[PDB]
Amino acid sequence: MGPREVTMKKGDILTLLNSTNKDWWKVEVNDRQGFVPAAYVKKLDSGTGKELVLALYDYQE
Known part of the structure; x- marks a missing residue:
């Protein structure tokens, strides 16, 4: 808990x-929690x- 910088690769399935x-949208990436664009996931x-959710495109701040 407590928003942190998360990244994702196209194809990742995030909680x-x-x-x-x-x-x-707030998601759990690895053992870290952060925000990713809702338009980038389904x-x-x-x-x-x-x-x-499924990551449709790569993302990194």
């Missing part, structure tokens, strides 16, 4: 923590109970 904001249908 979604908070998608209340339409533009920036909510997946499965991994039930746990929320998962």
Whole structure:
């Protein structure tokens, strides 16, 4: 907890923590938590109970 600089590669599947904001979603990358653009990821249908997103493009601040 406590937003930190996270990055992602196209194809990564991240655990979604908070998608209340339409533009920036909080996710767990490795053992770190941060924000990624909502437009760069897609909510997946499965991994039930746990929320998962697929990274569509690379991202780094």
